[model samples]
Target: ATPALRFVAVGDWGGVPNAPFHTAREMANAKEIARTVQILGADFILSLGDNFYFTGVQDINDKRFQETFEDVFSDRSLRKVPWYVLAGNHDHLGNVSAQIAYSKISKRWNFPSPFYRLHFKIPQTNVSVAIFMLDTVTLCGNSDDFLSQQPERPRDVKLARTQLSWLKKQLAAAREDYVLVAGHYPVWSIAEHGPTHCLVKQLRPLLATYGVTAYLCGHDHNLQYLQDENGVGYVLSGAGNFMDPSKRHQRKVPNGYLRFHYGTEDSLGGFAYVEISSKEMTVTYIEASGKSLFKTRLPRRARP
Candidate 1:
């Protein structure tokens, strides 16, 4: 009586050839998790973004794309599952057009639109999951002091306003078993990136009002999970690359990704295994060496 989906989420990966310690190792381990999900015939993967690091993907034709992304994630088993991604701050360094070019040539890279919606349906049931992909980089405005000094500030202002309006409408109209909102910046975090005030002040209200189940993000370069004022789970899966040793300002849990396992519980660490069923969701975090961490559970709907 349960239809389930299994997937993994990772972020802050992708480094040029010169960079030491590519994500190949972590991705290889992720492949093992993918194989396990495949055996269960699960759905696709969710990529939190920051796909390329140290100034984004400057040239899609550069060998970096292959060494940093394509070849690294070419695991036969994992390739079968689609990896949907959003843009991060680093990804915005270069012309956004390059992302489009890479997708045109890459078979494994799947992004319907820079921002779009996905629906996961539970066969033979009324349960349907809705996922909204957002572009936080644009919403955050330029972070660099120099960019903020630019004469044309209205463009950024208008873009933020437009996106906020769209987001509000989407959350208001959502009608699904579970609603997950994803962005590159966290609305609630203790990491160096901290919470995006604009998002917290503007978006969080809508999320709380609409009863969003989770807010997924990356950018802190560390994993984290916390609940906001309304207890909506906020998961930060930014451990794809190296971890930042910088202390967080207000972290509730240790730095790590969230692991959800169906019919069980949720955990954090190396690779998070999320099991999404019609009635409930479970997460289990496993270390890189494949050791169980801990587990937790959350109901399909907000609990009273």
Candidate 2:
């Protein structure tokens, strides 16, 4: 028997105080959906990236952590669940150092290793899920570009290299029932940022070889889903901050966060719920207004 685990994913969040604050309010009210998912029983929460805007936390002691993060998620219901976060370009301000410090101080926050693997056992089942968290922005040398573009480049290149090697090893050794690869950039997004070639050329091959089911990411500030040649799914859930209606990418799809229902059959646009079972996974995309946008299903096995 496989015990079930539920979790929520949000991304591209953390703008300056005023605008980002409103987005937080919306999510706060959206706790009902989370509770319903929780009532069904969810284990934790995952944040894609861009946790802070205009810059990452200036310092671990930066008052913004309490003001921006703590105050926003202060909703009684939202605070109860554990949250795992990744780093994005905006968060590169501190070169991810502040994010490390934030995780250390908060028990509910768990980003212990910048790039590492985590396994969650289904309470009463013979099933386990493996999460591969990667620092794509850092790994691709995006920080170098930022440094050249801006005076202060806050990211660390050496750290990114270390994590990338570790990620490859972890994927090779994973034997879990399901594997989810997460990062701040998407391998195949229809968003303004377009597809990430580095990931497509480098990581996708490994993900395909390792039997990874889905790749989740946050960038482009919108929601999107795309499948690769091997049929592995890639999702972008970067709708946490403000909405951008710009038609920047020729191959990009419309914007919105995805809500995936793993085993269930419910769907909508502003959110998505995904359900995973022993043999397969289901994703339900929903709109904030409670409309179903699309649904997709994939086998648990890797496609050759």
Candidate 3:
């Protein structure tokens, strides 16, 4: 029997301080998001980043974790699956190690390390995927000012390369049919922030060298999909909050999910749905109200 794989990807979804599911025009809450993922029958969540906001959590046991995450996403269906978590800029603001530590306590929290990898193997099938999760903040942020109040913040350039080298080794070792990399920053973006030169110099080559299928990230608050010159796909899904009309139009960077693009009448938040098998892979961008914005399919590497 040929097995299959399915999952949901979303990011920038933390809530207002102490404002649990208050319902904003910009985005939906965890309960609402969980409903969509559950409807799709996903195996797990591909948590992009910015999991927490407003200076991040104080520690693993910080009340905000419960308020922003545990409580906001406490739908019956959401709790059934595990969340492969990543640290965003907000999360990096506070105790980053605690987020990693909290994994030991929560069955659904999958951030065992600050950075790691996940392997999905379809039962009785030759299909497999290796997802390399990168701690991009260490490289994306003020590397010179490593003196963040948060203890786990990246403090050394050598360490970044050490870990990156480790990542290269891992990518070289993988024999999976697909290699998908996830991080907080985008190698190429048309958002207000623009492309990340650091990633282009440091991270992009690794994927090309290893032949990763696609790279997923969320930093700019928008939905985007593009193919680089290297033939690798770039998937961006950030807009997990209220769409600020004022900021939406004031500037232009050619984002795919601008208010005028999706239309002012529609809500801002959305998620990416991915379905995979040995033969092909499909990714769909779904709006907050269960509407699919766009989709694309990629056939597997031609069998010899």
Candidate 4:
């Protein structure tokens, strides 16, 4: 079973405008994120962004992209994969270039910019993953005020130092075979706007100077994984359409780096699948009711 590179990573799921637009807990977390991406068979679908709700999308023919995203992810194996978006902080409060111009009229939106880099390739295996899709509200700022309030700033400090020098030149020229790095803030979170002190001082020492293996994110609606101490990993799926059992920065992190967390309110919407083989990188955490609430693995990162 070596041919792997599955995916799923959702986030703030954008929903609001009632009437079948979503929120019955995002239509039961969009039918279990489309039945776990049609029974675990995906190649793409990251979307760590807030997507569109509370405020975001006002162009590219906004219909909330056809009501909170094509009528709440009308399956068809999630309309044939390929989501790959980015740009949260309530999608920068409005018009992140109309969600990157609806990724050229959506055929499974991909948000080409606002920060990018992707690489996949596990089909004929020889392994490769390389994500890196940040935008972190343009590198820290604008949490739409109320994650215990205090977020608006970097509207542009020279485009946050040119996307932090293009994420240190794409993690110093990544070598693939797994190198994730998504965003929406949370360079270590204890939930509720906690560790994003400008991505813990500029993306936590570049994920410990580029050995980077994981850092996906979301604005803390809930669901976490933490790791750090140089081992990296940090998931935090963002409970998809809305959830928040207020851990209110549980003593602000740091304490053997929490291995898992769920945020009660009966833990409704959630996500994070990931797979990436060629030796390891599991990471489960489903829960939209169909349980699978947690799992982890990580291992492959020594092939020099």
Give me the candidate number with maximum TM-score.
3
lDDT of 3 by residue, 46-113 (tens): 77887776566787668877766776677877788888988777777788888888888888888977
On lDDT, the leading prediction is 4
lDDT of each: 0.64, 0.65, 0.70, 0.81
Q: What is the TM-score of each candidate against the true structure?
A: 0.82, 0.82, 0.85, 0.33
lDDT for model 3: 0.70
Question: What's the TM for model 3?
Answer: 0.85
Q: By descending TM-score, how would the candidates be arranged?
A: 3, 1, 2, 4
* Residue-wise C-alpha lDDT for candidate 4, range 1-304, written one tens digit per residue: 5788888898888887555656876777789878887877877788888877777877888777888888878888888887889888776777889889888888888888899898877887788878889888777667762456445558788998899898899888888867888888788788777677778878888886778778998788888898978888999888887888777786878889889988888667788888878888988988888799889998888632
What are the per-model numbers of colliding residue pairs?
14, 24, 4, 0
RMSD of each: 5.6, 5.6, 4.8, 18.1
1 or 3: which has the higher TM-score? Answer: 3
* Per-residue lDDT over 1-304 for candidate 2, one digit per residue giving the tens place of the 0 to 100 score: 4446566666765746454344542353255345545554556767787777757777788766776677666665667778888887777765578788778788788877667777887676777889888878777745321232211222576765677678888888888888999988777655456566667666878887888988988676556667766667877766655454433453433233223211121221244456677667776554544445577787778433
- Candidate 2: stretches off by over 4 Å: 19-40, 143-158, 252-269, 302-304
Give the C-alpha miss distance for residue 264 in model 2, angstroms: 26
